Structures are given as C-alpha cells and as structure tokens.
Amino acid sequence: VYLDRKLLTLEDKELGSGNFGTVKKGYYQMKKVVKTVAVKILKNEANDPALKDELLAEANVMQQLDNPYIVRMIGICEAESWMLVMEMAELGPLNKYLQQNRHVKDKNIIELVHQVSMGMKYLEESNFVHRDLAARNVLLVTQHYAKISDFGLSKALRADENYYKAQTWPVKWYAPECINYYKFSSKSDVWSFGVLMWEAFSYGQKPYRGMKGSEVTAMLEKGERMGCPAGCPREMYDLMNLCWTYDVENRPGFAAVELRLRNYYYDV
Numbered sequence: 231v232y233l234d235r236k237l238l239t240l241e242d243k244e245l246g247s248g249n250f251g252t253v254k255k256g257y258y259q260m261k262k263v264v265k266t267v268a269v270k271i272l273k274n275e276a277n278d279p280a281l282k283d284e285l286l287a288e289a290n291v292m293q294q295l296d297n298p299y300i301v302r303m304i305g306i307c308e309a310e311s312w313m314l315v316m317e318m319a320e321l322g323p324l325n326k327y328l329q330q331n332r333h334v335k336d337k338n339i340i341e342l343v344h345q346v347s348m349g350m351k352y353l354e355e356s357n358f359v360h361r362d363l364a365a366r367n368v369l370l371v372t373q374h375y376a377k378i379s380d381f382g383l384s385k386a387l388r389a390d391e392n393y394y395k396a397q398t399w400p401v402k403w404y405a406p407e408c409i410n411y412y413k414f415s416s417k418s419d420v421w422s423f424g425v426l427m428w429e430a431f432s433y434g435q436k437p438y439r440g441m442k443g444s445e446v447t448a449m450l451e452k453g454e455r456m457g458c459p460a461g462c463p464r465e466m467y468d469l470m471n472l473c474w475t476y477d478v479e480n481r482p483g484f485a486a487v488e489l490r491l492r493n494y495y496y497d498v
C-alpha cells in the first residue's frame with residue numbers, strides 16, 4: 231500500500247514551506263521510467279498525532295479522487311518523515327504564474343478556469359467539499375493545463391447530507407453561510423470559485439485588497455461585490471457575480487457553472 235522509500239529520490243531545495251513542513255521535488259522509480267513527483271513532507275518534530283492525522287486525512291481524500299483536473303496522489307511514504315507523494319505540477323500556483331506572465335490571453339484564462347470548473351464538477355458529483363479553493367491552490371502542469379490541489383481542509387460528505395458543519399479561515403474566499411452558519415457545501419465551493427475567477431482575470435492580484443475579514447463580511451452584506459477586472463469579458467464577470475449569489479439556494483452548482491464556461495469557451 232505504502233511507497234518504497236528506496237525508490238524515491240528527493241532534491242535538496244524546497245519548492246515551498248509551511249507549518250506542515252516542506253514541498254520538495256523528487257523522482258519515484260516505476261517499472262522502467264522514473265516519475266517526477268511533488269512530495270509534501272510532514273515536519274512533526276514533536277510527534278503530534280493531530281498533525282500526523284491531518285496528513286493521513288488529506289491522503290484519504292486524494293486516494294478516492296480520480297480526475298484529470300485534480301492533483302493525483304501516488305502514495306504515502308513512511309520514512310524519515312511522513313510523506314505524501316503526488317504527481318508534479320511543474321509550473322506551480324496559478325496566482326504566481328499569472329503575476330509573472332501578464333501576456334497570457336483572456337482565452338487562455340477562460341480555458342484554465344473551465345478546467346478548474348470541470349475538476350470541481352467532478353468533486354461535487356463525488357460529494358466532496360474542498361473548503362480551500364483559491365488561485366494559490368490551482369497548480370499548472372502547462373500554460374494550458376490546470377489541476378486543483380490542497381485537500382487538507384476537504385471533507386467527504388455523508389450519503390444523506392448536503393453540507394459539512396464546521397467547528398472553528400480564508401474568509402475572503404468564504405460564502406456568507408460559511409461565516410454565519412459554519413455550513414460548507416459544494417455551493418460554498420462555488421462562491422470560492424467566483425473569487426478564484428476574479429483572481430485569475432486579475433492576474434493573481436489579491437482579492438479585497440487591504441481589507442480585514444470583518445470589513446469583507448460587511449461589504450458583502452451591503453450587496454457590494456468586487457468589480458470587473460481589466461480585460462475580463464462581461465460574460466465572465468456576470469458568471470463571477472452569479473457565483474457570489476448571497477442565498478445559497480439560488481446560487482448555481484458546478485454543473486451549471488461548468489456548462490456556462492464550456493459554452494463560452496467553445497461558442498466564443
């Protein structure tokens with residue numbers, strides 16, 4: 231079940247770092263080829279079983295997903311540290327990529343956000359809620375191929391329920407029902423997707439610039455929304471506003487969102 235540490239070779243440099251530990255590039259020896267991998271290495275210096283459980287829960291979610299627009303997990307490796315081994319998205323986070331590549335065309339942005347919506351449509355069908363959907367968690371394989379990453383806050387909904395009730399955030403990406411009722415659904419992921427669209431069409435600018443979480447909640451309760459980014463097609467801004475529908479019951483699901491993007495990409 232677990233991967234063989236002797237078949238894994240890691241680079242010295244870190245791709246990124248956090249409280250969890252590090253993400254490093256590596257190579258996993260397969261039957262005859264070697265596969266480039268991104269390895270999330272758990273820094274659990276104090277042997278906290280909570281942090282261990284968090285990595286294992288993330289791995290448990292990823293093992294159940296199989297879609298071209300979601301980062302694939304290769305396996306877990308129990309070695310010097312606990313390691314989650316994943317396919318490599320070489321070009322990195324979408325927000326950083328667009329910050330450094332402002333020549334990327336509107337049509338290319340639509341292509342990438344449509345791919346994200348196809349991954350999310352699959353997640354919604356599979357009854358998983360992501361709970362951390364943001365441009366920073368969309369990774370590029372190529373300039374024309376995006377994948378959803380970072381399932382650490384994700385929840386597998388029970389067969390008889392439509393939402394997850396929290397006990398606790400990236401408030402700028404959260405729907406009002408998340409803040410007011412602590413309820414997370416595929417519809418709250420749609421709200422987040424609207425913020426992600428705004429980020430992408432803004433070439434990786436931060437949403438609600440300079441504002442505190444409390445100020446964002448107040449703005450939204452007044453019915454105010456972020457504006458149309460420079461160069462963003464009206465039809466895409468209209469879709470962003472639909473994702474930011476206040477009442478969860480009237481907000482679209484990912485089937486509707488993906489269809490709108492699909493039609494706009496291919497028909498226009």
Ligand SMILES: COc1cccc(OCc2cc(C)ccn2)c1-c1ccc2c(c1)CCNCC2
Binds near residue numbers: 246268316319320369
């Ligand atoms: C400047 O950052 C990068 C630059 C290039 C590649 C990167 O990773 C390639 C990757 C990562 C993973 C988890 C799976 C598959 N491929 C990253 C990078 C570094 C840290 C994190 C990520 C991305 C995801 C976002 N969450 C924080 C953790």
Ligand SMILES: [Br-]
Binds near residue numbers: 238239
């Ligand atoms: Br090594």
Ligand SMILES: [Br-]
Binds near residue numbers: 325364366
């Ligand atoms: Br961010």
Ligand SMILES: [Br-]
Binds near residue numbers: 399403
């Ligand atoms: Br935030």
